[PDB]
Amino acid sequence: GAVTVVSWGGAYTESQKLGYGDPTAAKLGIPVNWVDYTGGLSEIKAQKEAGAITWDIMDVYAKDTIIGCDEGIFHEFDFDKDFLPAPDGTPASQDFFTSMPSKCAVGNILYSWNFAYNDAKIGDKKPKSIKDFFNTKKFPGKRAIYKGAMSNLEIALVADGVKASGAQAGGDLLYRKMEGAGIDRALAKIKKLCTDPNGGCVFWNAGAQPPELLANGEVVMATGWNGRFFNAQMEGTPLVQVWDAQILDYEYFALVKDGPGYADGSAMKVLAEMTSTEGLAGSAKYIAYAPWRKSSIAIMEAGEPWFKDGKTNMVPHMPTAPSNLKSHILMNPDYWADNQDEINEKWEAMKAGLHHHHHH
Ligand SMILES: C[SH](C)CCC(=O)O
Helix, strand or coil: CCEEEEECCHHHHHHHHHHHHHHHHHHHCCCEEEEECCCCCHHHHHHHHCCCCCCCEEEEEHHHHHHHHHCCCECCCCHHHHCCCCCCCCCHHHHECCCCCCCCCEEEEEEEEEEEEECCCCCCCCCCCHHHHCCCCCCCCCEEEECCCCCHHHHHHHHCCCCCCCCCCCCCHHHHHCCHHHHHHHHHHHHHHHHCCCCCEEEECCCCHHHHHHHCCCCCEEEEEHHHHHHHHHCCCCEEEEEEEEEEEEEEEEEECCCCCCCCCHHHHHHHHHCCHHHHHHHCCCCCCEECEHHHHHHHHHCCCCCCCCCCCCHHHCCCCHHHHCCCEECCHHHHHHHHHHHHHHHHHHHHHHHHCCCC
16 A cells, blocks of 8 residues: 655655655555645644545654644654664664654754855845845845745844854754844844835745746745755756855654554555665755765765766755854754744734735
């Protein structure tokens, strides 16, 4: 019987299919099929409440591993029994480079939220910083920003000169500066960008939209996920990524309880093979996202140039390359799991106000 995996489409799903989905299906004799979504838990909640679950494995935001565990949607793993050791025998829990954010999480890759411009369209002046993203005088034009408050409030505060720490024990220090007053400042900063006659905002929802909007000249700068920009660059689109105030984030799979392949163990077998050392390394032959396992990272590094063409080195394109980390923010998933409802109410009220005061 087939196992249904849910992921984010475009270049990301392709990297998973080619790197580890199709190999897993062929090895195990369990078909592995892919469904596109755009994140969150609303679809799976609707399926579960209807008693009609068709999804088996979900590629999920870090915050959704926490929420989906707490809501009883996802299976709590017994990590070193359920996931495979590294080839040298290292248990999975010691091979994955840090701890899981929830008992329902297993890592796949790390990705960055950053931004890009089209070098052929932007003009002679070139954006270089997150402050430039907000600078409508030096760089007039529309911006594309993510549909949700998450990631936007962080970059708005850093563009306002509030300091992030990047990764350290206890998470990024930025989040302690995102109480009520900091949230209000971040909302005001975004509202200012989107209301400026020399700015304005397109809200993107799907990962393919930021590179497409830049390729077509619909915005002058767009936030997005670095692997989507990387894919467009490798296809010949003259985008340039800016890594100042990039947000380093961690992605996961979760196993849907009561999905079609849950009781018979088929979904778990697929998941263990997809998240193997070889599988996670294989995905990085296709897209610039870093494997979660130390063993997989070591394979990629030893095998450079690791890209599918046998000539492009992948390490300099990774979210974790030191050159790309110089001013990063580390995403805090507990913050968003805990506070997204309260924040989203204020965020959506801000977005509704953009329309209500908009004159055709
Ligand atoms: C899995 S999405 C949250 C980020 C990576 C991508 O889709 O390119």
